[PDB]
Swiss-Prot record, chain B:
Methylamine dehydrogenase carries out the oxidation of methylamine. Electrons are passed from methylamine dehydrogenase to amicyanin. The keyword Cytoplasm does not apply. It is found in: Periplasm. GO terms for biological process: amine metabolic process. Its EC number is 1.4.9.1. Belongs to the aromatic amine dehydrogenase light chain family. It comes from Paracoccus denitrificans. One of its GO terms (cellular component) is outer membrane-bounded periplasmic space. This is Methylamine dehydrogenase light chain. The gene is mauA.
From Swiss-Prot, chains C, D:
It catalyses: 2 oxidized [amicyanin] + methylamine + H2O = 2 reduced [amicyanin] + formaldehyde + NH4(+) + 2 H(+). Keywords: Disulfide bond, Electron transport, Oxidoreductase, Periplasm, Signal, Transport. It is found in: Periplasm. InterPro entries: MeN_DH_Hvc, Metamine_DH_Hvc, Quino_amine_DH_bsu, WD40/YVTN_repeat-like_dom_sf. Its EC number is 1.4.9.1. This is Methylamine dehydrogenase heavy chain. Methylamine dehydrogenase carries out the oxidation of methylamine. Electrons are passed from methylamine dehydrogenase to amicyanin.
UniProtKB/Swiss-Prot annotation, chains E, F:
Its cofactor is Cu cation. GO terms for molecular function: copper ion binding; electron transfer activity. GO terms for cellular component: periplasmic space. Cu cation binds at H53, C92, H95, M98. Keywords: Copper, Electron transport, Metal-binding, Periplasm, Signal, Transport. Disulfide bonds: none annotated. This is Amicyanin. Pathway: One-carbon metabolism; methylamine degradation. Residues 1-105 form the Plastocyanin-like domain. Binds 1 copper ion per subunit. Primary acceptor of electrons from methylamine dehydrogenase. Passes those electrons on either a soluble cytochrome c or to pseudoazurin. It comes from Paracoccus denitrificans. It is found in: Periplasm.
Amino acid sequence: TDPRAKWVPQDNDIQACDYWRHCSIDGNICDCSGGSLTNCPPGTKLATASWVASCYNPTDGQSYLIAYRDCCGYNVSGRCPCLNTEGELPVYRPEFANDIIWCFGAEDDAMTYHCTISPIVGKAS
Amino acid sequence: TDPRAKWVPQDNDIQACDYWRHCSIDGNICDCSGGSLTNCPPGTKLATASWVASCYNPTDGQSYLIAYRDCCGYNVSGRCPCLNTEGELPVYRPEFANDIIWCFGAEDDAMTYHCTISPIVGKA
Amino acid sequence: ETQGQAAARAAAADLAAGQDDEPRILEAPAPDARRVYVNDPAHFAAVTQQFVIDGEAGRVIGMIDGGFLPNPVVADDGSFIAHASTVFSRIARGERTDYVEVFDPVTLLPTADIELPDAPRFLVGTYPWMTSLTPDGKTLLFYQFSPAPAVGVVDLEGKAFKRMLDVPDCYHIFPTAPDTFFMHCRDGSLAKVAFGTEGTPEITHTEVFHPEDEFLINHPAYSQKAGRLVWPTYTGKIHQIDLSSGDAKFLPAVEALTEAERADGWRPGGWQQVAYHRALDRIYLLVDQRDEWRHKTASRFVVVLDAKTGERLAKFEMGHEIDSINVSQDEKPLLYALSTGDKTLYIHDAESGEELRSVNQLGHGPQVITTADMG
Amino acid sequence: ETQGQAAARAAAADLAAGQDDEPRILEAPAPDARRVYVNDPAHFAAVTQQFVIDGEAGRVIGMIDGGFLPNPVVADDGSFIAHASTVFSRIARGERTDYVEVFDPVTLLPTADIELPDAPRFLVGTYPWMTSLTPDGKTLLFYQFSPAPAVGVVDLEGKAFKRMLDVPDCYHIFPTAPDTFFMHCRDGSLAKVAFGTEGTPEITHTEVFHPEDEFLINHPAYSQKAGRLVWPTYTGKIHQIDLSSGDAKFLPAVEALTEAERADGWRPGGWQQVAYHRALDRIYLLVDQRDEWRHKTASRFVVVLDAKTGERLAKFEMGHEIDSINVSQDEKPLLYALSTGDKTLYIHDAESGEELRSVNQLGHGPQVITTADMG
Amino acid sequence: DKATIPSESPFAAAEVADGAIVVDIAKMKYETPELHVKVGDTVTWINREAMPHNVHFVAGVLGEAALKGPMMKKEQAYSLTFTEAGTYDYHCTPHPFMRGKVVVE
Amino acid sequence: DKATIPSESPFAAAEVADGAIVVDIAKMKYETPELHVKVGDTVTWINREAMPHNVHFVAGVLGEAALKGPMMKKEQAYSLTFTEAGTYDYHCTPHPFMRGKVVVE
Ligand SMILES: [Cu+2]
Ligand SMILES: [Cu+2]
Ligand code: NA
Ligand code: NA
């Protein structure tokens, strides 16, 4: 309810914007349009490159590197929109920048934004 | 407002869905995207053909035939949406049917829906 | 426990187990009797969305993009879905392209993209029966309104536009055979249209079956498998036409509302006002109290009636402003109740009327519910 | 609703006088200092809208459609407007076309459509200075991020794409002349890029002017007529670079928030966080109390400070959740305050901060406000 | 093209000559489905009702371009002079169920 | 084309042979940004950080299509065999400021 209050992760509901892996997500949660936490919906194209962030997991007290890869080639889903920016840097540090449409590498050179997945790619500690 | 109550026309605000000339409008009021009661916004194309309806003017107690010509060749304005159906008939009476995109005759063969104007074309 | 929480549990278990995330593109589950499609014409927006929903789980299982006022169809047998759609070279102006796409119903990938020459689609708020499959699933038929009434013939099997059929001043397309469909006419008759590979089609008419001042709605329910066409009027009178023989047979007319209800202001109202369940031979109709010219407003009630006798079987208080109804065509059917204003599909038990689950955030102005009759 | 009310009164008089309605297509009033453009990226939708607004009346006087995340520009002299835009052959998939359109600012009709070869636009939430006009209006420059950093040169006079310029790892484009523009680099320098008709540009870097852990926002204010680049950091420190000589001169850094405000958790936040009035030499910044990684949330306050001395002139409590600000560039300017969440432009007196009027229903997620410095 | 237009816009029914070739429009119908005239004749349609109507010849019928006539209000009229033998179909723009032909002999 | 792909997807780096030709990736840089090899040599990139990286050669460098290598997670490796003398530039897809060059002699 307080947009300006510090982000508080949970690890009980992936379709909510405070889910701990969504800590620097900008877009829509794929699980709300027939994808899953870490997979793209049918018909969409899976980007290979993305922005990243370290998100803290309240369950085990460790931080993990999330790769925010976009599912592309469809109009925006419009379901479960979220915008978080934990550790998000401006565009001149694109590796950590989340206004960018991270669709590069998707099949068929698809570049339109539909939704974002939140797979873990590493430990951040 | 009760959506299901009898529609009650007014003659004091063209931007509200109960303005008397909007008795069979379906879409968006052109006055809210830079058109006027009876003119299209800049850049859009003016349909020549449309559905019509007889609308009652509470100011003078007369009914006028309104021609709901669409302004076309733009995405829908999204401002001042209205849907009224006074006297509105199904698609097999197209002359009084309002789900149709009444863009025919528009310049450049524009057929997308932007907004609707409410000009008077005759008395009842 | 919600879908999102089960999913968080599973993902937590995966991470505890040290199982790596390896992203891929999912496939939808197999089309079943409880899959439901919701089209969002988005208040006449230049681009639009269809939501594929698992009605049993109340979950979005996929989506299909379309252009301006597209017409969705679904193979009764679950083997494909398609739409007739319209795009422009510069969003809502420039060169117009009308086309049909066929989609694989599990990968949701397009398997045909077939251009329709000369921009022949009828651009109108979405009426399911303005674009229709033949019973064999081989042909798509679509209506053209202007410059003259006509029906387009699209060969889905050979993936090619075939031709336009000149037809009389009639509207809607109800296919009864691989080569025949019916339409409803200005004068209030039905036309039967039988067409070949070449030549004038063969066109016959029934008699006029309603008065000129009895208005038949734009959203009649039509069961191709039963050959039953269920046509409400603005007063809740119901015409029914039996087309199973390949020719039109008018059934006894029924009233969905009582004389007392009519005198007390009850009328049907909404978009997809009527549904028909084939196995149960039941009709569902969205009604409420309204002035006579508020017929497209949402309704808060559904009445259910036997199609043979006209006997009222139920009256459900829906608990939301409902614009559109439909039913699954399986044994204990779901009643789908779509709210354009809430942008939410409400999923009800058809027997009791009880609300079972809902699916929200279905675009900007969702209006059309479509189900396969897989039996 | 006095506008809707004045209109109803005018039309009533026309009818009572027997003046016939003769529908026409309007022209917008001539561009003036109080015209303001509101762009709606619509939360990454495949199609988008721009609203042209008379800020003095609080009235939409026109609209322009665009494609996927377009970049709008407006000639300072009011002679035209343009955008770089992206469309696809099948709504959001198929062949991509990037293009520039120029429009007449009274008929709103496209006067040029210039295709950009090889889809080179940078698809990113909308940053005004990622596509920029040169001061004479004859050239439009746009940024390419991938496969390599580059600036596309588009000749608006000749209506033709010219070429892509290779540049260093730098971002945003601040032109000062037909041939020269500045960019901001990964290492925290500015690059000057000077280019002729042929050949590689001459590139000159300044000193690094901020540390690597001091973060410069994506929406600096740039007054091309003043050559003044106003660049906030996440803490509200403001870098000012004077580019008026076509060489970068660093001005004294100024803090927009007080040390006590900062201790108390005040930071800038939103989208277009900063505006600059050229004739008054004032900076306006969106600020609120907020945690440090909430830098894109809306803000409820605007501080106004003297650009030369850093003196605080005012702090306004705005009364809404404001994502973006800009000012008219005339003598007693308006302060425009756009809410993405309310889809509403609030129009304020910049001197007293008082809300004068608002314009609502501005699309799905409006974010960018542009004005012409005509004077 | 095959015809010239006497008047760009509709004019008053009362301005039609006592002897003119006239097609009345009323009850959502043209008076004849098939009007026979000679080369050089002028046809005048007169809308007799409040519902606006026109005549619309698609592209290729009277020339390369379509000839979409102006909408007539009640008691307004619109003419065309046919300059070449042939048969020319037309319809009313919003009402495609209103169809006629002029046969020019 | 001018190169051959040993493994289509990234493989464990522990599976890379000693004295193999290796470019390490760490701190957002290719650690050997200008590599000289012989015709027939196999180059192996190894990501040393949690930040995903790849190699990407534009259309016309290694052949007609661009080679957009797969993203390597930490301690993943990816190889290319260069089958023709020349100079081949590459970058990291999400990180175009990360650039390199294989000079094949
Ligand atoms: Cu007519
Ligand atoms: Cu990299
Ligand atoms: Na993004
Ligand atoms: Na309409």
